[PDB]
Amino acid sequence: SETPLLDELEKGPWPSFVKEIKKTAELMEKAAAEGKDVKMPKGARGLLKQLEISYKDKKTHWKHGGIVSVVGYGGGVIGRYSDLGEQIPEVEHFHTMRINQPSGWFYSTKALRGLCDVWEKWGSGLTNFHGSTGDIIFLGTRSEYLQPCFEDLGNLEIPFDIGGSGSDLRTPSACMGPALCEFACYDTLELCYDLTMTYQDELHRPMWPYKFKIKCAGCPNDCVASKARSDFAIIGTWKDDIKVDQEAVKEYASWMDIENEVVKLCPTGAIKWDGKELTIDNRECVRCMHCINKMPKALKPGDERGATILIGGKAPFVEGAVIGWVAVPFVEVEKPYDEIKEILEAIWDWWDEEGKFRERIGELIWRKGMREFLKVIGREADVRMVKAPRNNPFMFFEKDELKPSAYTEELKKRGMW
Amino acid sequence: SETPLLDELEKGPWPSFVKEIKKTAELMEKAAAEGKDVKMPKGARGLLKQLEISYKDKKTHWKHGGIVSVVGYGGGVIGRYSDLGEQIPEVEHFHTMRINQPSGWFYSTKALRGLCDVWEKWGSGLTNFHGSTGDIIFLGTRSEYLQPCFEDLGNLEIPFDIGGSGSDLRTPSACMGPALCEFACYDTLELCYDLTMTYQDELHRPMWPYKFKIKCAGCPNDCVASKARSDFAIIGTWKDDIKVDQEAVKEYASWMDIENEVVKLCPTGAIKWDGKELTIDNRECVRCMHCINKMPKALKPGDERGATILIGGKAPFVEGAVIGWVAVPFVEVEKPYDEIKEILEAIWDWWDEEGKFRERIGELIWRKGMREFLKVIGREADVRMVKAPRNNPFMFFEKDELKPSAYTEELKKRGMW
Amino acid sequence: EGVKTDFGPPYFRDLLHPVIAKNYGKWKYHEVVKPGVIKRVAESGDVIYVVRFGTPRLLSIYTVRELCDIADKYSDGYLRWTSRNNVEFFVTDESKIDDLINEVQERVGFPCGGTWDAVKGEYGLSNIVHTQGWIHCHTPAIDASGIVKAVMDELYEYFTDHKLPAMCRISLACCANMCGAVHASDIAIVGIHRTPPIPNDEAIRKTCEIPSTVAACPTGALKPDMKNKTIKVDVEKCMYCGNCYTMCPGMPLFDPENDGAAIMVGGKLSEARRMPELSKVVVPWVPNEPPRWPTLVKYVKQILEAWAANANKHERLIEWVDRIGWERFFELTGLEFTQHLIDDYRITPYFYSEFRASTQFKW
Amino acid sequence: EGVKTDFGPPYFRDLLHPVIAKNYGKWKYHEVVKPGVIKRVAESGDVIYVVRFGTPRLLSIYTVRELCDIADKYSDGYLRWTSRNNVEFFVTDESKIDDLINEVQERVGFPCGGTWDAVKGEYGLSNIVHTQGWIHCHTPAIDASGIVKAVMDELYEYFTDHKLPAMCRISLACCANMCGAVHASDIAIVGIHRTPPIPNDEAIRKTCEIPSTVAACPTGALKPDMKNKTIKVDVEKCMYCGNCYTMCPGMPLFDPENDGAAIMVGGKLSEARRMPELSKVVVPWVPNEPPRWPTLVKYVKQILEAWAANANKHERLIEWVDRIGWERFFELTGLEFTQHLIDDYRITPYFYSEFRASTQFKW
C-alpha cells in the first residue's frame, strides 16, 4: 500500500476526499497516455505522496511562497512550494488560482465543463467547491502555466476571471436571496455581481493597507455568515409591519405549539397569539426572523425594505475576533447602488490614507474612534450603534462645542487649538 | 449679606450644609469670646468666606497639598492650603484628619462628645459623618495642632486613632451586619474590627505601590458597596438550602402577588409557588437575595455560611472602573480569620514585589493574569470566576504541561526553557 | 511614657445599645413601619425601632452635641450613622417614636425618612453620597455640597415617603477620580473637564517627577521633553481626565466656563434579580451654575421622573432598560444621543467583560 | 491584441434554471419534504424541489463532470452549491426526486441531507466549513479534510436525518488565522501551537522584514536585535499564535508533538431568538492523531451528544448555556475548567463589548 494512513480514510459513510484525490491522478495519467493535452498529469499523485508523508510526520511539507501572479493583476494567485521539492519533483510548484464565482454559486453545466477542460490541461485536476470567501479553487499548478490557463479561461465561451487575494477587495459573495428564498429583502445576487464588476481594479490590483471583504445577506438569518466573515456586511431588513396572513396562522395553530415555540421565544415579547388572532407590536420587533422562520406560510417581511450595514467583521489577528457592529442602521438597495458605493469609497479613501500595514478596517475604527468613521461616511451617531452608552466619563469634545473663555483664548494664544 | 450666593442654599426643605458652617462659626466665636480654650475660632467663617468666592469664580481655591502627618504615622492626614491665605489667613492651613470610625458607625453619646470636645479645642469645628471610606472627617486645622489633637484623641476616656490615607491599607468598613440585620451571614463588625487591629502598621505607615481598601458586607445585598468601593470585597453567602417557613409564605400569599413579585423575578427560575407550597431548587439558586428580601418572615439564608471574595473593585484611573470579580467562591469567616489573613498577606507580598508605582491590585492582576494571582493565593481555577470562557484560542501553557519532544529538547539546548 | 499610637478605633461592641448587644445575631425579622421607621424583632421577643434621618453629611460639632442630647433623651445614649450618611436612633418605647421624630425635625432640621420597603414594593430616595468639592478638594470640576443640596430640595418628597417603584441611588463625584459610588449608581453626577492641560515648564521642573506623570496619562497623550526637561501634551489624544494634574501641579487644565458635570445612569450594586452594573453616560455635559445648578437639577429630575412613571415594581433603572432598550430610554427621557456616548476608552481589556463581576453563581 | 482582463465572473442571471429565472424574487413559501428535500412554491403556482447533497469540498474535475451528467438527467443542466459547500439540484417532476437521490449515491457517493426544518423544529447537522490543512497551507497546526472526514463518519447519522432539537454548526480552522466561520460556530475546531518559535538568525536577515515581524506580534514578545540584525523572542510573552511565522519564514514554531486543536463552543451567526455570539474555548488542547483523530472526535461527539440530550426545541448550544450557566455546562458535557480558559488576551478593547454586533434593534 502506497498510502497506509490516507487509505484508511477511504473507509466509512462520509464521501472521502482521499478517494477524490486518488480518482483525479488515476484519470489524469490515463488521459496523458491517451495523447490528451495534459501538462501536469502527475499532479494529484505528487500531492497524494506529500500528504501521506505529512500524516506520518504530523507536520506540513509546504514552505513560504515566492510572489507569483498573472500579467496586469497583482492578486488572485497564491504561490506554494514543497519542502520535498526534489524528492517529489512535481510538487516543486503547486500554486492555487482563485476563480471568481457567479453570485449565489449558480451554475449551468456548460459553465462548469469549460472550467474543467482548462484545469485538466494546465493543472492537477484538483479543485475546491467552494472556498470560504466564495471563489472556486483550482488546486496545484506551476509558474509558467498560470498565464496560459488565464488566457484560456478568458477565451472560454462561458469565461471566468480571477478572484482576489493579498491586500485588496476580496471576491464578494451573497446568499441565494431572490433566486430561491421568500425572506429575501433585496436582490443579493445583483448587488454582489454589480459590486464585483464596479471594483474590478480594486480586486485585481492590491493597493490597500490590507484586505477588504464584502458579503450580502438577504435577511437577518445571514446565510453567508456576513457579520463574521466580511469587513462590510450588507444585511437585508425592513422598516414597516411584518405581513401577517390570519387564516394561515390558524392552520399552523391546529397542530403547532405556537405559545412555546413562537410567543415565548420572541426576544422582546413583541408577538402575541390568543387562540383567535396573531398580533405583532412592530415598535418592539427587533426583526430576528424567528417568527417568520417558524411560520413562512403566514408571516412575511414587511414592504419597506433595504439593509443594515455591519462594519468590521474579522478573524482575531491582530486585535481580536470581530462580529461586525452597526454602522448604518438602514440603507436603500436599488441599482446602481450609489448610496452603498459612496459609503464604500469614503471608507477606502480614508482607510488607504490613514491605515497602518496589515490593519483591517475594524481595527482602524477602534484606533481612530467612531466619530471619525462617521464623519468619513457623512452619517450621525445613533443609539442603535451601541448595545449600551459608555461606562466612563472620558469623552472627547470638539473644540467648537466649547464655550469661549479666557482659557480657550490662552490655548489659541499658544497655538494649542 | 457677606455671602449672598451661599445664603440661597439656606432656603429649601433639605437640611443645609451652609447652616452647619454658619452655626459652627457663630458658636466657635462665641466659645472663644467666653474664654473657652479654642485655638481656631475663625476657622469656620474663613471656610465660609472662601466657599463664597469659589461659588462666584466657579472654581476651587485650594492648592496642591504639601505633606503633613502625626508623629509616628505616614498616613491619615490630608494637608490642604488655601491659595487665598493672605486675604483669608484663618484658612492658610486647613488639613483634614481622618478618624477611624467604630465598626458599622455605632456610637454612644459619651464617645461622640469626647470627639466634639477635642475638635472644638484644636480645629474648625466642622466635620463629615462620614467620609466615604468610613472615617470620621475632622475638616480643617493647622499643622501645629495635628499632633496635640492626636494626643488628646488618644487620651480620651473612649479614645480614637487616626484612619488611613496614602498608599496604605485604608480604614476597613462594614455593614451593620448581625447587630441589627437578620440576613447577616457572618460577623461583619467583628471581622472589620479584627482586620483593623491586625493591620494597624499597614494602615498607619504606607509602604505599598498604591492604596488597598477592604469592605465587609454581611450578605449579597452588599449594603457597604464593597464590590465597587474596595479592592477586597468580603461578601457573605451560604452553601446549603434557604430555610422556608411554609406557614409564613401562606401568610404572605394571602395579600402579596408572589408569582409576579417573587416567582417571575428570580434570575434563575429557582423558586416556585403553586398556591399551597413553595419550592426552591437550591442547586439552581445564585443566592441573589430577592426572595428573602421580599419575604423576610418566611425565608432565611441557609446555615452553612461564609463569604465570597470579589477582587479588584476600584474607580477608573488608570485602566478603567472595576466592580470586583470572583477570586474566592467560598471562605469561612471565623475568628481569628486565619484563612482570610493568609489570602491578604499573600496578595500584599506579591503586589509589593511586582506592582508598579500607583498600580492597584486589580490592574496588577490584569497585567499578570489570573494564573499568577491564583498561584499566589494557592487556589485553583474555577468556572465561577468567569462569566464566560475565553473567546479566543491564544492560551499560555506551562512548560511542564507539554509533551517531551525534539523541539522541547531544542529549546532546552538553547536556554529558552 | 511616649504618646500612644496603633490602638485603633474604639471597639464597637462596647458602643452598642444593651438591647442590640443582647440580641446580636439573633434577630427574627424586620418590618418597615412607615417611612423612616423600621421595627426589629429579636428571637428573645425584644423589639427595637430604628429611626432614620437625612443629614447634610457635613455636620457642625454643635449639631453632633444636639444629636447627643436627643439620643440621651430617646435612645438611651446610643445611635449610629448608615453607609449613606443618614443618622439612626434606637427606640424601645414605640409610644416615643413620634416625639423623637418631631424633636429631631425641630432641633436640628433633619427629616425622618430615607427608608424603603421591598416587601410592599415601595421605595424612598435616600441620601446622595458625595465628595468634598470646593469645600476642601484641589482637583474638583464641580461642587459637591451645593449640587446635593439643590437636587435634594427638588426631590425632597421622595426622601420622606415611599413613592418610587424600586430602589434608586443617586451619587455625586466632583471629578473623574470618582471618590464614592458614582461608578455603580442608578443615577450618578460626575464632574469633568473639557479642556487640555497647559504645561507650566518651570513648575514641572521644580516639582514634577516626569516619568510617573507621563505614565498616569491613560491615552499616551504625554511624552517627556528631554531638551527642556519637561512634558509635552498631544492635544489630539487628551480627553481632559485631569490625572496628570493629580500627579503634577505644573499640569492644570481647569476652565471655569467649560468644567461641568456628566450624568450617568444604570449602575447597580446589589445582586437581587439582576447582576451588578457600571453606570453609563447619558448626558455628556452640563455647566456649573452655582448656587442652584438649574440645568443639572432639571436633567436629574427629568431622568428620575421618566423612570418612575414607566418602571414596574422592583424594576430599578438598569432593569427598566433591560426591558425597553436604550432607543426607548433616550426617547422617554427626552435625551439626545451623540457620538460622545460611544465608548472610546481604549486601555480597558475586553477580558474584563468575561470575568464574573458578581456573587451570583450556582454551587 | 492582449488578453481580456477585468471582465469578472459570468452573469448569475443567465446561469439560472428557467423555472428559477421566471419566478425570481417572487416565491410564496418553502416546505421541507423530508431530510434533504426542500419544496419551493412560487407565487405563480409553480413548484420546484431543491435537493441537497454533501460534497467533500475538494472535488475532482471528473466528479464535477459526473455531477454535470447527473445534472442533465435530473435538473435540466442546472445546479448550485450552498454557502456550506453542499450541492443542490433543481428537480421539477417530483417522482424523479428519489431516482436522483439513488443515482448520486451510485456515482459520487454523496448522501442526501444537510437540511433542517424550523417549522417542525427538527434539525440536521450540515457539512463542516473547513480550510486547507496539510493539502496546501504552510502554517497549519492540524489537518482540515482528514479531521473533517473523521468527525463526519462518527456523526454521519445526524446529516441524513433530523435528529436534533436546534441548529448546530460545526466548523474547522487549521491555525489561529481562523479562516471560515470558526469564531462564530456552535462547535469549533481551531488548530493551535503550544511551542514558542526558535528564531533562525540566517533566514531572517535574508528573507524577513524585521520591523513588521516585530510589529505583527500581538503581545510584544518580539524585540529586534541591534547587532546581529535579527529578532529575539521573550518566551514569557509568547502565546504561540503563529503570527510571526506568517510574516517571516525564519520563525518556525511547529512541534509535531505539541501541536493540536482547541475545541470552542457556543457561537451564533443568525439573529433569531438571541444575539450573535463569538465562540468560547472549552477544551484547551487535543493531540493530532492521524489517521482518525479519535480524541478530537470523542470530545466533539460528547459535547454534542450532551447538548442534544438536554436542549429544548430551537435551543441552540449558546442558548442552552444562557439557560443552565457554565457551571452546569461543564458538568453535563463532562469537561474540565482550567486556568487556560480564563481570558488574558490583553489588546482587545473593552468598548467593543458595548458596540451592537447585531442587526437586532428597534426603529
Ligand code: SRM
Ligand atoms: C482560500 C482560503 C482557504 C479555504 O479553503 O477556506 C483561505 C486561505 C488563506 N488565507 Fe484566509 N482563506 C480563506 C478565507 C478566509 C476567511 C473566511 C471568508 O473569507 O469568508 C477568513 C476569516 C475572515 C477574515 O478575513 O478575517 C480568513 C482569514 C485569514 C487570515 C486572518 C485575517 C485577519 O485579519 O485576522 C489570514 C490573513 C493573512 O495573513 O493574510 C488569511 C490569509 C490566507 C492565506 C493567504 C495564508 C497564507 O499565508 O498563504 C491562505 C492561503 C491558503 C491557500 O493557499 O489556499 N486568511 N480567510 C479561504 C478562502 C477561499 C476563497 O478564496 O474563496
Ligand code: SRM
Ligand atoms: C474624603 C474622601 C471623599 C469624601 O469626602 O467622601 C476622598 C477624598 C480624596 N480622595 Fe478618594 N476619597 C474618599 C473615598 C474614595 C472612594 C470610595 C471609598 O473609599 O469608599 C474611592 C473609590 C474606590 C477607590 O479607591 O478606587 C476614592 C477614589 C479616589 C481616587 C481614584 C483611585 C483609582 O484607582 O482610580 C483618587 C486618586 C488618587 O488616589 O490619587 C482619590 C484620592 C483622594 C484625595 C486624597 C485626592 C486629593 O487629595 O485631592 C481626596 C482628598 C480630598 C480632601 O481634601 O478631603 N480617591 N476615594 C473619601 C474618603 C474619606 C474617608 O477616609 O472615608
Ligand code: SRM
Ligand atoms: C442601614 C443600611 C446598612 C448600614 O450598615 O448602614 C441598609 C440596611 C438595609 N438594607 Fe441595604 N442598607 C444600606 C445601604 C444599602 C446600599 C449601599 C449603598 O446604597 O451605597 C445598597 C446597595 C445599593 C445598590 O444595590 O446599588 C443596599 C442594598 C440593599 C438591597 C437591594 C435593593 C434592590 O432591590 O436591588 C436590599 C433589599 C431590600 O430592598 O429589601 C437591602 C435591604 C436592607 C435591609 C432591609 C436589610 C434587613 O433585612 O434589615 C436593611 C433596611 C433597609 C431599608 O430601609 O429597608 N439593602 N443597601 C444601609 C443604609 C443606607 C441609607 O441610609 O439609605
Ligand code: SRM
Ligand atoms: C442553503 C442555505 C443558503 C445558501 O446556500 O445560500 C441556507 C438556506 C436557508 N436557510 Fe440558512 N442557509 C444557509 C446558510 C445558513 C447558515 C450560514 C452558515 O452556516 O454559513 C446559518 C447561519 C449559522 C449560524 O447562525 O451560526 C443560516 C441560518 C439560518 C437561520 C437560523 C437558524 C436558527 O434558529 O438560529 C434560518 C432559520 C431556519 O429556518 O431554521 C435559516 C433558514 C434558511 C432557509 C430556510 C430560508 C428559506 O426561507 O428558504 C433556507 C433553507 C435551508 C434549510 O435547510 O431550511 N438559515 N443559514 C445555506 C447553506 C448551508 C447548507 O447548505 O447547509
Ligand code: SF4
Ligand atoms: S439570509 Fe435570508 S434570504 Fe438569504 S438565504 Fe438566508 S434566509 Fe434566505
Ligand code: SF4
Ligand atoms: S421577528 Fe423576532 S422579534 Fe420580531 S416579533 Fe418575530 S420573533 Fe419577535
Ligand code: SF4
Ligand atoms: S449587606 Fe446584608 S447583612 Fe449587611 S445590612 Fe445589608 S442586608 Fe443586612
Ligand code: SF4
Ligand atoms: S435568592 Fe435569588 S436566585 Fe435564589 S431563589 Fe431567591 S430569588 Fe431565586
Ligand code: SF4
Ligand atoms: S471626587 Fe475628585 S474632587 Fe471629589 S474628593 Fe474625590 S478627588 Fe476630590
Ligand code: SF4
Ligand atoms: S488630562 Fe488626562 S488625557 Fe489629558 S494629558 Fe492629562 S492625563 Fe492625559
Ligand code: SF4
Ligand atoms: S486556517 Fe490557517 S492553516 Fe487553515 S487554511 Fe487558513 S491559513 Fe491555512
Ligand code: SF4
Ligand atoms: S508566536 Fe505569536 S506571540 Fe509568539 S512571538 Fe510569534 S507572534 Fe508573538
Ligand SMILES: O=N[O-]
Ligand atoms: O482618599 N481617596 O481614596
